[PDB]
Amino acid sequence: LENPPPPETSNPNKPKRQTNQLQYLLRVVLKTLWKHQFAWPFQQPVDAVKLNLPDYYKIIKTPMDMGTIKKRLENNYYWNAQECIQDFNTMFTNCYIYNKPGDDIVLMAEALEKLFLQKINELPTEE
Ligand SMILES: CCS(=O)(=O)Nc1cc(-c2cc(NC3CNC3)c(=O)n(C)c2)cc2c1ccn2C(C)(c1ccccn1)c1ccccn1
């Protein structure tokens, strides 16, 4: 099986804006998670061919990763903050679906998710 192409990250047919909350999501939320010790397996799409994980894309049909999220924020792909938050949540839930509870990768995702939820509790004021 091939890897699928990565998720779309730039679409000039989508309207674009900068907002307080989107700026925060890139400069605080993504930045804080990206520098974490456990961020590295989540910084790009799961490379199922390289890892010899042939069944990954047989069950994960909405892949997501922080590299994709970063590029979506840099290319003004999201209009609403919640679209970006939803992508982070998809990334965590995919990990909790494919991997057994308590596995190393799940514990890594759970550490990142705890920090993510703290930072989302400090989302700044909307325009
Ligand atoms: C940067 C993205 S990458 O694909 O290029 N690199 C990687 C992504 C994922 C990965 C695996 C998932 N699942 C696997 C772990 N057992 C089933 C999963 O869900 N995610 C989100 C990520 C794991 C990766 C790598 C590169 C090496 N690792 C190993 C050392 C790893 C890291 C952390 C925890 C467990 N194992 C590894 C080696 C061999 C096979 C699978 N993993």
In a domain, 12, yes or no: no
d(CA 55, CA 94): 13
* Residue pointed to by tokens 């949540």: 89
How many structural domains is the chain composed of?
1
**Angle 81-98/66-74 helices, nearest 10 degrees?**
170
CA of 1 to the centre of ligand 1 (A): 17
Domain that holds residue 92: 19-123
Per-residue exposure over 75-90, b if at least 16 CB sit within 10 Å of its own CB, e if not: ebbbeebeebbebbbb
In a domain, 69, yes or no: yes
Pocket of ligand 1, candidates 47, 60, 96, 105: which has the most ligand atoms within 8 Å of its Cβ, to mutate?
Answer: 105
In a domain, 50, yes or no: yes
How far does Cα 121 stand from its chain's mean position? 17
Q: Whose CA is nearest to atom 6 of ligand 1?
A: 41
The count of other CB atoms within 10 Å of the CB of residue 10 is 11
Q: What kind of experiment solved this structure?
A: X-ray
Give the DSSP letter of residue 75: T
In a domain, 4, yes or no: no
In a domain, 1, yes or no: no
* Residue pointed to by tokens 């799409």: 45
CA distances from 127 to 20, 69, 73, 104, 124 (A): 7, 22, 18, 40, 10
Whether the Cβ atoms of residue 21 and residue 81 lie closer than 8 Å to each other:
yes
In a domain, 111, yes or no: yes
Structure tokens at 80: 């609403």
User: Taking CB atoms and a 6 Å cutoff, what residues make up the pocket around ligand 1?
Assistant: 41-44, 46-47, 50-51, 53, 95, 98-99, 104-105
In a domain, 9, yes or no: no
Q: HSE, CB side, 13 Å, CA atoms: give it for residue 88.
A: 24
* Resolution of the solved structure (Å): 1.2
CA of 80 to the centre of ligand 1 (A): 30
In a domain, 51, yes or no: yes
Structure tokens at 87: 């992508």
